[PDB]
Design a protein around this ligand. Structure first.
Ligand SMILES: CSc1cccc2c1N(C(=O)N1CCC[C@H](C(N)=O)C1)CCCO2
Ligand SMILES: [Zn+2]
Length: 139
């Protein structure tokens, strides 16, 4: 679990969005596993606007933050799970690192701010849904 709080927006994994999130929807994209809902109070997370490929992510299944190198946002095949059929997920970045189902929502950050959140994993890999292209989160 986990979310990004920027301005009057809450960014979560679409597959983990609560009933309150759908009742206050701003934008969602199943192909990116992202959902943005509106908030009453202002959030303090700063979104990164960069092309960094190194950062630190939070891994709830280890209660630890790990430094990682990660790929550029890409269209990547994700096998069928309990949340989606087999499909290509867009804007996804992979890194070599531990992740389990329960770790989705963990933040990935670089020196410029929030880069994305854990969205996929398996086989000693961890994948993050990029948010650096969503310029509108800043306004
Ligand atoms: C951090 S998720 C994870 C981590 C390790 C092993 C894993 C996972 N699972 C996932 O990758 N998914 C479940 C949640 C939604 C994902 C998506 N964006 O399509 C897919 C479950 C199946 C494969 O097994
Ligand atoms: Zn950066």
């Amino acid at each position: 679990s986990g979310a990004i709080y920027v301005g009057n927006y809450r960014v979560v994994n679409r597959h983990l969005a609560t009933h309150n999130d759908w009742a206050n929807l701003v934008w969602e994209d199943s192909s990116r596993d992202l959902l943005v809902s509106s908030t009453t109070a202002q959030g303090c997370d700063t979104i990164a606007r960069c092309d960094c490929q190194t950062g630190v992510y939070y891994c709830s299944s280890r209660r630890k933050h790990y430094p990682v190198s990660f790929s550029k946002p890409s269209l990547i095949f994700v096998e069928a799970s309990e949340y989606y059929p087999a499909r290509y997920q867009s804007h996804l970045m992979l890194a070599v690192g531990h992740s389990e189902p329960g770790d989705c929502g963990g933040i990935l950050r670089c020196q410029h701010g929030v880069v994305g959140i854990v969205s996929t994993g398996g086989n000693g890999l961890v994948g993050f849904a990029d948010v650096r292209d969503l310029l509108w989160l800043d306004e």
